[PDB]
Write a protein that binds this ligand. Structure first.
Ligand SMILES: CC(=O)N[C@H]1[C@@H](O)[C@H](O)[C@@H](COP(=O)(O)O)O[C@@H]1O
Ligand SMILES: CC(=O)N[C@H]1[C@@H](O)[C@H](O)[C@@H](COP(=O)(O)O)O[C@@H]1O
Ligand SMILES: CC(=O)N[C@H]1[C@@H](O)[C@H](O)[C@@H](COP(=O)(O)O)O[C@@H]1O
Ligand SMILES: CC(=O)N[C@H]1[C@@H](O)[C@H](O)[C@@H](COP(=O)(O)O)O[C@@H]1O
Ligand SMILES: [Cl-]
Ligand SMILES: [Cl-]
Ligand code: NA
Ligand code: NA
Ligand code: NA
Ligand code: NA
Lengths: 191, 271, 191, 271
């Protein structure tokens, strides 16, 4: 009976606490370090499932537009056939909020065995995480019950946007040129 | 500047009693005890006035100020920009700005009314392109687990073939942040001509909006340039999460049962 | 050194033998029977993985255009959340050329337990196939080795097109109207 | 009309010997024995002329005709339209017609030349919409397991962003059956202007074709009306399967190893 209902209040609070939490978790030298891993990589891959898969889909879109040669895969067979053709010049970002999705975990090791660098985003620390090149711990939702939780993508979209910012300032002139081409008059499939 | 040093500095200025109270506060473990100016006064068998005198001898206006600084020193640590990088501060302020923006835009009776439209609908459809496509896909994933019969479409061909099999019992939620994607906008009119309810999620108050059952104004990003803009999904996820919360509380017992069926032991394709 | 190379010959022969084989397998009263199951169903679903998934994708496209309310799903979680909201008025077509993909098999039973009618397309007869409402045996590829085989979709696209033909002639006037709407002048998203 | 009855009918017309040969052929198990007119003549200790006389007494022009009808009766069964339904005959004739059509259109040195373009390319892309999108997706799935670095795209936004990061080392295979989908056609020119090789798969000899490194004429369907047309994928799958066969035999040892890696015991995400 005030500016907002108890339900509108609960949602907006979960968002606020996701920003406060994410702030206390930032390891800027890691986030920047990863941003450079993308640049120095021949091919980048984003593995994810469910909502963690939608997070992988957007990242492919955003970085492709900055000139990155990348793909997003969201199913086990895609991971397995993609891993079989990886090398040391590959980088894999694995998205698993629970830190337990077997397909996501096994793929990063598969990528590790083929020589590729491996990054893991998850809200739950584990010990297999040592095996990966980096492990970015994201925020945990503030709703105890799964059903009442806000979008599962958010803990990860926070750190995607930060890595995006650190990456964009690396040789930004070239990236911003590749990005504006979408609107260019010569472009025959543009806006 | 340590409050432990300040009491030690003034220890030899204090009367025989105030020197005893200094001992209490100088022990590192009193920080755990209750210090509400009555539990502390009892514990030491003293008067409040006694404690107040103690405080002013250490350099404070009263007891209330002293304990305030005394306690809060346990969590003082760093209060500057630990996240120094102004680029990091740029993203985080885009996120906070968005949430603040979102708050001002909420029409709570509209959002609930959309939540109801979803329930009464037989088939719900989500239309979106690019990043707005991911938003539509997530809404399908989230509301299907509450039992909603829905589909998510992200190409023009899909919209047209989906609109051709709609009727007055369908509902179409279209997602176009700019408010100008022709396929999304022309697909809502398509659906409306078939009798379907239509909702539009966009940050731009456009005039075509009037041709839809609902039009939800989401927030604009805070970055002038597109290239620096944070994810295009969020203006919409804010409101998606709000409609989901309203919707979830409509016949919740039913929905929670369908949502938990994913983890059912009888479920042959679950966890 | 003739009209065609030994390699062009091998491919075109595998196609021919796929038509000859498919012909000897047709159970017309079954194919037509299934065509009616689609009509009498409130909601139709197509489950498939890999190339069997692409076969499910096309079928959704073709039948949706005849006015069928249908969806195609190609991953385990999609199957599981879709099955949880099925009823006796649902029909599920499951596509598994090997007849062994665990996700596909378990979903049809899941659909069976929720009351939905279940159809299975596979080139290998099994005994769990008894549990399904129908079981359409398709042709087997004529190349011994997996790698040298022609497209994995074909054994199934044969029978999709036959069921499509039997279905289209059921109340064909209504379906053909729903189909031409794509090109209609009033249609605001058309051709 | 049974050949067993015919010999029985004429049994009492045959000489003492021809009645013995009737016994051989009347046994149901001789059908398994060798009957090349020399193994049969040996086995019975007879001359060929003897057998020929036997045949003409049963009603045949020679021994060769008799055994021909005699043997082939084991698999005679039904030779009419078991698949009676003329609708079923409609689909099957669309399929056969397609394969026949495809044969006449094959430019074997073009198809092999495309197979080579794929090998030399660093990044391969498949563009297609609707049913032509499924064709592009399957090609990605099939050639990735031979080690090819490839991606499949099925929306306009995807084509534009993909073309902007192409160069002279890329190859784009565009799939438009009609030969007139603007997004597919304008995306090949996009790629070409970036230096990429371009291939077009379409059934319509168009003149834009001249602006591409290759243009593959696939078959037209046999059904005038679209609604009755069988799957739109096939005209292209025919040629896809042909390019795959040519491509697979380029450095096969390497490719087969990458293909079998899916079933590797060391593979941590395989079978
Ligand atoms: C508990 C639960 O409902 N999980 C679902 C999704 O919420 C999640 O996005 C997906 C990937 O999970 P992740 O790999 O841990 O991110 O798995 C499940 O489909
Ligand atoms: C301005 C711009 O770059 N647009 C691109 C995406 O960022 C966007 O998500 C999509 C949908 O646009 P929307 O419908 O306005 O959300 O169109 C384009 O792909
Ligand atoms: C042996 C093999 O390589 N199988 C692959 C695909 O060819 C197949 O399409 C898919 C679904 O298989 P299905 O369910 O048997 O059709 O499984 C695998 O990804
Ligand atoms: C005539 C027609 O109905 N076209 C539809 C589909 O059948 C087709 O697959 C797709 C690509 O068309 P293509 O590029 O000519 O193959 O466009 C439309 O979705
Ligand atoms: Cl905030
Ligand atoms: Cl044939
Ligand atoms: Na939450
Ligand atoms: Na922003
Ligand atoms: Na074959
Ligand atoms: Na045809």
């Amino acid at each position: 009976v005030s500016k907002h209902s108890p339900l509108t209040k609960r949602v907006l609070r979960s968002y606020s606490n996701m920003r406060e939490q994410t702030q206390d978790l930032i390891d800027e030298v890691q986030l920047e370090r990863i941003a450079q891993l993308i640049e120095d990589a021949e091919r980048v891959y984003f593995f994810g499932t469910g909502s963690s898969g939608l997070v992988a889909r957007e990242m492919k879109l955003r970085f492709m537009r900055l000139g990155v040669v990348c793909e997003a895969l969201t199913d086990q067979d895609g991971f397995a056939w993609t891993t079989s053709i990886m090398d040391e010049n590959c980088l894999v970002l694995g998205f698993s909020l629970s830190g337990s999705t077997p397909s996501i975990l096994d793929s990063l090791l598969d990528a590790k065995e083929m020589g590729a660098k491996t990054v893991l985003f998850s809200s739950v620390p584990n010990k297999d995480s040592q095996a990966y090149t980096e492990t970015v711990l994201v925020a945990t939702h503030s709703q105890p019950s799964y059903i009442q939780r806000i979008s599962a993508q958010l803990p990860m979209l926070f750190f995607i946007d930060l890595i995006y910012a650190y990456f964009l300032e690396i040789n930004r002139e070239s990236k911003e040129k590749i990005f504006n081409s979408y609107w260019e008059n010569k472009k025959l499939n543009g806006y």
